[PDB]
Ligand SMILES: CCCCCCSC[C@H](NC(=O)CC[C@H]([NH3+])C(=O)O)C(=O)NCC(=O)O
């Protein structure tokens with residue numbers, strides 16, 4: 001019943017978990033390797049002290065329970081705290097959308113810092129994937145038109161937070177990315193303004209990734 | 210004419226070229242996109258005004274001559290200014306070493322920052338590749354012992370500078386990485402203390418990569 005999240009000092013694959021905790025107002029210890037200096041030694045000492053299944057982070061520890069694999073952690077958390085949808089179909093859709101997010105998020109990460117194929121990403125990959133998500137929001141649109149935007153049903157799911165996080169990452173590095181996608185831009189403003197998320201984000205230190 | 214080097218605000222693909230210019234004492238303009246605001250917009254405006262063969266940087270402009278492709282630029286510069294060996298065979302060896310540096314450099318860049326496969330990089334690939342270079346260094350032993358270390362022949366080549374740049378970069382992240390490779394470490398210290406290089410490095414700005 002004591003909750004601790006371990007990861008490096010970065011958003012990366014731990015950020016959606018932090019967002020979920022913030023949304024749900026669950027208190028926990030956000031352990032970031034390297035805050036005490038020397039990320040290498042901490043992570044090394046961490047693998048000695050804790051029984052990780054694949055020697056990787058994020059690791060979420062609940063009391064004595066070691067949980068690994070960010071995706072599995074996200075899905076487990078979401079079922080326990082009721083943001084995994086209201087039906088079996090919607091649970092699937094939230095899941096499907098989260099997997100879609102992983103596809104572009106991966107590409108975004110591979111291009112933003114190194115500028116690797118930045119032009120191809122910004123001209124082909126990004127608008128195509130943003131178009132996919134725009135169309136999903138649209139298919140779910142008259143599930144609350146009153147400035148509430150959800151990808152799945154009439155309630156918030158981890159998919160909303162996952163898409164938020166993704167486009168939160170993208171519009172900062174690439175301002176006005178959302179301008180051609182009105183539903184997606186609105187969705188990003190909506191969830192970003194939810195008080196718990198609004199407070200987490202303003203309190204959130206800047207980071208390289 | 211005026212030499213202008215065009216790249217993003219980073220070491221990456223341009224640094225070796227800058228090291229060659231520093232080493233040779235060649236004056237040029239080091240134009241860096243995105244020093245002040247969003248590199249992608251500046252790069253976009255650059256391609257509109259400049260005819261590049263592949264719409265990518267680095268670009269080296271000498272007069273109205275436009276040169277693209279970092280590796281080809283290095284070789285051209287190195288042949289022009291006599292740091293490419295002194296026999297057809299040593300010219301090949303410098304080239305071979307450079308290509309080897311690119312294999313390991315790519316791995317270091319792909320795993321540093323994100324930590325994707327860090328322990329694989331650290332316990333397998335880096336030591337392996339460090340051993341390759343150490344071994345190549347030993348093979349050039351007769352090409353003196355007199356506190357001078359070269360990979361090829363008995364004069365500095367761009368391969369020396371490439372290997373330097375490779376471990377200068379790695380040593381930032383993993384500072385003890387050359388403790389088991391004393392000849393490689395001495396090599397690295399020797400290059401870094403050449404007056405033109407020492408000077409360029411002290412004055413060099415810090416970067417994420
Ligand atoms: C933008 C984020 C992309 C970067 C991915 C790297 S996350 C850090 C890395 N862990 C993983 O790759 C975990 C992947 C796993 N599939 C998950 O989702 O948790 C690690 O423990 N690294 C330490 C090591 O391998 O030694």
Ligand SMILES: CCCCCCSC[C@H](NC(=O)CC[C@H]([NH3+])C(=O)O)C(=O)NCC(=O)O
Nearest residue numbers: 114115116117118119221265266278279318
């Ligand atoms: C760790 C450093 C390695 C990062 C690789 C990307 S360097 C920037 C990129 N250019 C290239 O990929 C050039 C590759 C070419 N083979 C070279 O070596 O010059 C670019 O112009 N990008 C802009 C664009 O595609 O729009």
